[PDB]
Amino acid sequence: PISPYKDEPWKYLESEEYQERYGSRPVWADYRRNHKGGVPPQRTRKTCIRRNKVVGNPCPICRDHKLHVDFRNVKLLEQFVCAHTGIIFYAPYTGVCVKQHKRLTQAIQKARDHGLLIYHIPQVEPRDLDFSTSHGAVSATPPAPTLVSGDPWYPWYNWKQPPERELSRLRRLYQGHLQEESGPPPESMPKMP
Amino acid sequence: PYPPLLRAMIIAERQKNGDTSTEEPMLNVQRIRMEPWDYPAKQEDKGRAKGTPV
Amino acid sequence: ETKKPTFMDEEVQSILTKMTGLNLQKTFKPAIQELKPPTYKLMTQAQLEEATRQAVEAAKVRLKMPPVLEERVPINDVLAEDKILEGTETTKYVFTDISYSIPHRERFIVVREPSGTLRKASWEERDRMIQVYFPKEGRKILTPIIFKEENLRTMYSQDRHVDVLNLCFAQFEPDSTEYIKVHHKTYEDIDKRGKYDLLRSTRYFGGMVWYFVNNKKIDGLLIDQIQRDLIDDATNLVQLYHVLHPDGQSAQGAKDQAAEGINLIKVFAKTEAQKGAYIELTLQTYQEALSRHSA
Amino acid sequence: KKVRPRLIAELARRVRALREQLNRPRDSQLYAVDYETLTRPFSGRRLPVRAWA
Amino acid sequence: LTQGLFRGLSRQETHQQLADKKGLHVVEIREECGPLPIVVASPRGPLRKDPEPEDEVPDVKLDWEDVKTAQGMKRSVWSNLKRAAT
Amino acid sequence: PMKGRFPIRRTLQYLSQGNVVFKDSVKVMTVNYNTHGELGEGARKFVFFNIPQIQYKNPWVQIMMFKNMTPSPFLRFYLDSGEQVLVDVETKSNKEIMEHIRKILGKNEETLREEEEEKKQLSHPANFGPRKYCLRECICEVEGQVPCPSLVPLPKEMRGKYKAALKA
Amino acid sequence: KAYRGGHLTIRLALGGCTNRPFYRIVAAHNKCPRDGRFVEQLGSYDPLPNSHGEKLVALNLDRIRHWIGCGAHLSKPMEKLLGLAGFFPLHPMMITNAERLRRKRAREVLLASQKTDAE
Amino acid sequence: RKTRHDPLAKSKIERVNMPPAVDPAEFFVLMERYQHYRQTVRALRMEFVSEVQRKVHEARAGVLAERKALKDAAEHR
RNA sequence: AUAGGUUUGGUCCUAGCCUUUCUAUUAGCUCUUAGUAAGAUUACACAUGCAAGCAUCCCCGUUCCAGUGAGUUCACCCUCUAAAUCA
Numbered sequence A: 001p002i003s004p005y006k007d008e009p010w011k012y013l014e015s016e017e018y019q020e021r022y023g024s025r026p027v028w029a030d031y032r033r034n035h036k037g038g039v040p041p042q043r044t045r046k047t048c049i050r051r052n053k054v055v056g057n058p059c060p061i062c063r064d065h066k067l068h069v070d071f072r073n074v075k076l077l078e079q080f081v082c083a084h085t086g087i088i089f090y091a092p093y094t095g096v097c098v099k100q101h102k103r104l105t106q107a108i109q110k111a112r113d114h115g116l117l118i119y120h121i122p123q124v125e126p127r128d129l130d131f132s133t134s135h136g137a138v139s140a141t142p143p144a145p146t147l148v149s150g151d152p153w154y155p156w157y158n159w160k161q162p163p164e165r166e167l168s169r170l171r172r173l174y175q176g177h178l179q180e181e182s183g184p185p186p187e188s189m190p191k192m193p
Numbered sequence B: 001p002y003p004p005l006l007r008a009m010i011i012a013e014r015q016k017n018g019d020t021s022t023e024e025p026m027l028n029v030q031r032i033r034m035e036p037w038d039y040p041a042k043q044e045d046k047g048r049a050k051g052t053p054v
Numbered sequence C: 001e002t003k004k005p006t007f008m009d010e011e012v013q014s015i016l017t018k019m020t021g022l023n024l025q026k027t028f029k030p031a032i033q034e035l036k037p038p039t040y041k042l043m044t045q046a047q048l049e050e051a052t053r054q055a056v057e058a059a060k061v062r063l064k065m066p067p068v069l070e071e072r073v074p075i076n077d078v079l080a081e082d083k084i085l086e087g088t089e090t091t092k093y094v095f096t097d098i099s100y101s102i103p104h105r106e107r108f109i110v111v112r113e114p115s116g117t118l119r120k121a122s123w124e125e126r127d128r129m130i131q132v133y134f135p136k137e138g139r140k141i142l143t144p145i146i147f148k149e150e151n152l153r154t155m156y157s158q159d160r161h162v163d164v165l166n167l168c169f170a171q172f173e174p175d176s177t178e179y180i181k182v183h184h185k186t187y188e189d190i191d192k193r194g195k196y197d198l199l200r201s202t203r204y205f206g207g208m209v210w211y212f213v214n215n216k217k218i219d220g221l222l223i224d225q226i227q228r229d230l231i232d233d234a235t236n237l238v239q240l241y242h243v244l245h246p247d248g249q250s251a252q253g254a255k256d257q258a259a260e261g262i263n264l265i266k267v268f269a270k271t272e273a274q275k276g277a278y279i280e281l282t283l284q285t286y287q288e289a290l291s292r293h294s295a
Numbered sequence D: 001k002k003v004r005p006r007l008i009a010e011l012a013r014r015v016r017a018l019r020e021q022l023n024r025p026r027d028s029q030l031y032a033v034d035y036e037t038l039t040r041p042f043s044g045r046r047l048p049v050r051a052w053a
Numbered sequence E: 001l002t003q004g005l006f007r008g009l010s011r012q013e014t015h016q017q018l019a020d021k022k023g024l025h026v027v028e029i030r031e032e033c034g035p036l037p038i039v040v041a042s043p044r045g046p047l048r049k050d051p052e053p054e055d056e057v058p059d060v061k062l063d064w065e066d067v068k069t070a071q072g073m074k075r076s077v078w079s080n081l082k083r084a085a086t
Numbered sequence F: 001p002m003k004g005r006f007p008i009r010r011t012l013q014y015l016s017q018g019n020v021v022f023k024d025s026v027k028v029m030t031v032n033y034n035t036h037g038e039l040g041e042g043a044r045k046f047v048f049f050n051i052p053q054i055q056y057k058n059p060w061v062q063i064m065m066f067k068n069m070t071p072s073p074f075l076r077f078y079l080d081s082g083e084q085v086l087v088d089v090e091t092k093s094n095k096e097i098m099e100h101i102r103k104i105l106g107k108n109e110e111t112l113r114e115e116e117e118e119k120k121q122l123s124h125p126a127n128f129g130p131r132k133y134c135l136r137e138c139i140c141e142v143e144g145q146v147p148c149p150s151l152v153p154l155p156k157e158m159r160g161k162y163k164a165a166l167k168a
Numbered sequence G: 001k002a003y004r005g006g007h008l009t010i011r012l013a014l015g016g017c018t019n020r021p022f023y024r025i026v027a028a029h030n031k032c033p034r035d036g037r038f039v040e041q042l043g044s045y046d047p048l049p050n051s052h053g054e055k056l057v058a059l060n061l062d063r064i065r066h067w068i069g070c071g072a073h074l075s076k077p078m079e080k081l082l083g084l085a086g087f088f089p090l091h092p093m094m095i096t097n098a099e100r101l102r103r104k105r106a107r108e109v110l111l112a113s114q115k116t117d118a119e
Numbered sequence H: 001r002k003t004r005h006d007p008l009a010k011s012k013i014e015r016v017n018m019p020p021a022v023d024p025a026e027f028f029v030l031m032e033r034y035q036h037y038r039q040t041v042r043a044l045r046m047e048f049v050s051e052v053q054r055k056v057h058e059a060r061a062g063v064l065a066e067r068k069a070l071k072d073a074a075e076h077r
Numbered sequence I: 001a002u003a004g005g006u007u008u009g010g011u012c013c014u015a016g017c018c019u020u021u022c023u024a025u026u027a028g029c030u031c032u033u034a035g036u037a038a039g040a041u042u043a044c045a046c047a048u049g050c051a052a053g054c055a056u057c058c059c060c061g062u063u064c065c066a067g068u069g070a071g072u073u074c075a076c077c078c079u080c081u082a083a084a085u086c087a
C-alpha cells in the first residue's frame, strides 16, 4: 500500500479514519501477543514484515500502514512513552516488534533533541566552585628565553657537525662496515611541488 | 632549563602560592655525572658462567 | 572612588531575590520521573509550620542565582615551538592532565600541533576534554542540536524558556560565548513577548533583570509588575536602575524631586523610559483601582 | 595448616650448591676460545662478529 | 482469594479516617516534589496539640520476604519480568 | 513474620544506624548489667538494642557481657595503651549511655567524613576498565571517538585485511 | 606472584578490538603480562584521530611523578609521549627520525625535479 | 617462549647476525644526544625522589602531624 | 513468580512432579552477505617444523611471557625482614 500521509504523518492522527479505528485509546490498546504459557517471551518478534510480506498477527505499528514513526509525529510517539514517568515502554509492554521499537526509540530521542517532545530537564549544579581565570594554566605563561630568542629549547636538538678527529675514530672502529657520511639535515621539511 | 610543560607548571605554582620571581626554574645537573659507557664497571658484583660443559 | 554595584553585591542580591519571589508550588513542581510510593507523617499544626519553613529554606537554596560572568578571553599562548618535529606527525596531540585534586580551571591541557608548536588548549578544547575524562551529568561532548536557532525558536514557541536555560547551564560554562549568547537570546524573547512570569520563582530571574537594567530596557518588566500589582518590586526595579545608572536623567530627577515609592516610577517614566506614555496609563489604572479597595 | 615437610627439596639444594663449588668450571675452561672458528668450546657459542678481529 | 481480596479492600482506612481518629494532619511527602509538605487530610474536628509519641524502635512485625528484598538477598528469575500492559 | 521480639533489630538498615565508631585505642568493651531491678533498665535496653549496632560498626572490638556479677551495671573499656575507662551506667537510659560513650570514646563526625573522602579518591573517573572498577571499559564509548568495530564496521582503509591487499 | 627481581615500569597496555587499538598507561611490574596485573593506571592514549582530528592522551602527572620517584622505569613509546607533551625533553630518536625523514624527502624532491626538468 | 632446557633449532645452528652499518656523522651526534638526554632525566628523577621522601616525613613527623597528635592526646586526657 | 496444569464421584487442605522465563553445550533438519567476540571431550599418546637470544669476548636473559586445571583452605590482613628498582 501507499499511505498519503508519509509527507505529513501528523495528519493521520487528526483524520476521521483514525478516530473511528482507535478513538482516544492508544493504537496498541487492543493488541494481544499469541504465545504459549502465561509468561510471554521476554523479546518480541524481530520484524513483522519480511521481504514485503506481513506476518499473521502484525504489531500495532505494522498492522496499520498509515502510522508513520517519524520524529515529527509527536502525538504517535507520545503514546509509547509513560506520561507519569517519561520512560519509553519496553517492547513487551505494547507488543511492537524489535524493528519498530528501535525506530520508535530513535524517533523519540530525535523529537526530544529538536524540542518537539517535552521531557524533564533537571536543574544541575555548577561544575566549578571558583570561576576565576587567573591561574597560569588558562592565563599567559611568561615566554621562555629560548622561545623569545628563537633557539631550540635544548641546544642538542640542532645538528652540530662532529669534529673530523671524532669521525676518524668511528671510521677506524667500524672499518669495512661504514655508510656514506651524512651532511647536516635540511633546515626545514621539504615538500613535493 | 626545565622541559616546557614542567616549567609552566612550576611557574604557575609560584603565582598560585603568591611567589613573584622573574627567575626561570633551572634543573641542577652539577650533581649528575655522565660517565662514558666504556668506564670499567664493578667486577665484584658480576656473575659467572655455570658448570654445564659441552 | 564610587564603584557601581556588581551583580553579587549583598544589596543587589536582596533586591533581585525579592523581585524573583518564592512560589513553593512552582519551585517544587512534581517532576515527571521514576516514582516511588509516597510516605506519610501525622503532624500537628506546629510541626506542619516547621516543615513548611524547612521547605522555604530548601527552596531558597534551589533558587540561588548563578553568578553573571564576563565572556572569557580566548587563550592563545604558545609554550614552545619545536620546529624539528614539523612534518613528522599528521594529527595534533591533545594532552590532558587528569590529576584528580585539581580545580578544572587550573588544569594544564596542551596541544602539540603537526607544525611542532606546543600551545595551551583553547577554551573550547579545554571544556571538551574535561567532559571526556571528568564526565558531568547533563553535559555532552558534541554540542546538542537544540541550541541551533531553528530549534530554540520551537522551544520558545512552547513557552519552554526555563528548560532552554537549564539545558544551557548544563552544557556550557557560565563565561562561555555560547552560554552568554543563549541566555541573551532567551531574555530578548521574554521581553518581546512579555513572558516574565515564566522565570519568576526560578534562579534565572535575577540574570534576566540584570540584563534589562544594564541595557536600559526595563520598560516591559515594569509594566508587567504594575499590571500584576507588584509595585514594591517595580519601585525596587526603578531604584536599582538608578543605582546602576547614577548619572542619568531619571536618577537626577529622583534626586532633584526626592521621589519615593510610586513617584520614582513617574519620574523614570517621563525622563528615560522609552514607553513613557504606556507606563503612565498602566500606573494610572492601578492607582485608581487601589483607591477603590481602600474605601 | 601444618605444611608437610619436603625434605628432598632441601637435600638436592644443598647437594647442588656443593657440586657447584667442587666441580666449578675453571677460568681455563670457561674463557677458552677456538681461534679457527672463534667459538668458546665449553659453551659452544660463537663470539660476536665485531669481536672476531 | 476473591473473598479475601474484598475483605481487605473494604476495611482499608482512608487518610481522612486516620486524621479524624488521630486528630492530626496527614502530610504526604513525595520524592518527586522534594520537601514540599502537602497535606492530604486534616481533622474535621479539633486538632490535637500534643505530638504523637515517637517510639525510638517500632515494635512492628516485619515480613521476611520484604526485608530480604530490600537487602538484595532475593534472587528470582521470574520477578520483574517484562509483561504486556495490564 | 520475622521471628523474635523487635525483629527490626535483625535488619542491615537498623544495624547501620549506630553512631558510635570507637577510636582505634578501644580494644575490649565489657558490659556488666543486672537482669532485674529498675535502676538497671537502661543497661538492659542498651544490651538489647544497642550492642548489635555497636558491634556492627566496630567488628574488631571484643564485646563481652556479664550478668548479675555486681550490684550495679557498669561499662569498662580496655584501651591499647592499657588504660581502663570505667563508665557507670546505672540510672541512665540506653540513649544516654549510647551518647556518653560516643563523646568520650567515639570518633567525631569530622574524622569520619575525612575517611570517606579518602575512599572517594580510590576510584578515578578517568580510569578505563571493567565495570566493577571503572565507569567506562573502552575509549570507543566516548562519543566522538572512533566507535567499536563490533557496533560500527571500521572504514576499509583502516582495516588490516585491506592495508596489505592495497599494498600487495 | 613473587617475580625474581624485576622492577616497576610505566608502559602502554594495549586494549580495544581488532583494528581499533587503545592504550592504557599503567605502572606495572616489568615481568607482568602486557595486559595483566598493574599497580596503578596513570592515563590513556587513543592513537586513532577522533572526529576533531585529535589523538587524545591523558596523563595523571601527579601520580606519574610519584612512581618515577619510587624507581619506575619507562618504556620507549611512553618516553616519546611524555616528550611530545613537554613533561620530558624530546627523546633523541624522534629528533633523529625527524632528520632522517627530512633527508629522505629532500632526496625524493631531487628525483622528482629531474623527472620534470630532463623530461 | 622457549625455556633454557628446550633444544635449539637446527635451522638456526649457523645463523651469524651481521651487525648494522655505522654512519660516522649520525653516530657521534646521536651518542651526545643520549648523554645530554639522560643527564637531564636523571636530574628530574632526583627531584621526584626527594619530593616523595619529603611527603612521607611530613606525614610522619611534620609540624601539622605532630600538632594533631598532641591535640588528640590532650582531648583524650 | 502476577502464577499455571495434575490426586477425588465431588469439595477443601497439604504435598510432590511438571508447564510457561533466561542461558550454555550436543543431536536432527536447515542456512545468503558483512563486522566483531568466542572457540579439543580427556594432566591420554605424540611424526614433523618452529617458539631465546643479545652483545667487542665477561655478564645479563632463557626463573619471564605463553599453557593447563591434576592436586588443593601457600592467595587476603598484621608483624618481621631478604632479594630487587630509584646510575
Ligand code: FES
Pocket: F137, F138, F139, F140, F141, F147, F148, F149, F150, G016, G017, G020
Ligand atoms: S570495546 Fe572499545 S573498541 Fe571494542
Ligand SMILES: [K+]
Pocket: none
Ligand atoms: K501444586
Ligand SMILES: [K+]
Pocket: none
Ligand atoms: K544445531
Ligand SMILES: [K+]
Pocket: I054, I055, I060
Ligand atoms: K649480554
Ligand SMILES: [K+]
Pocket: I069
Ligand atoms: K584443578
Ligand SMILES: [Mg+2]
Pocket: none
Ligand atoms: Mg635490600
Ligand SMILES: [Zn+2]
Pocket: A047, A048, A049, A058, A059, A060, A061, A062, A096, A097, A100
Ligand atoms: Zn512490527
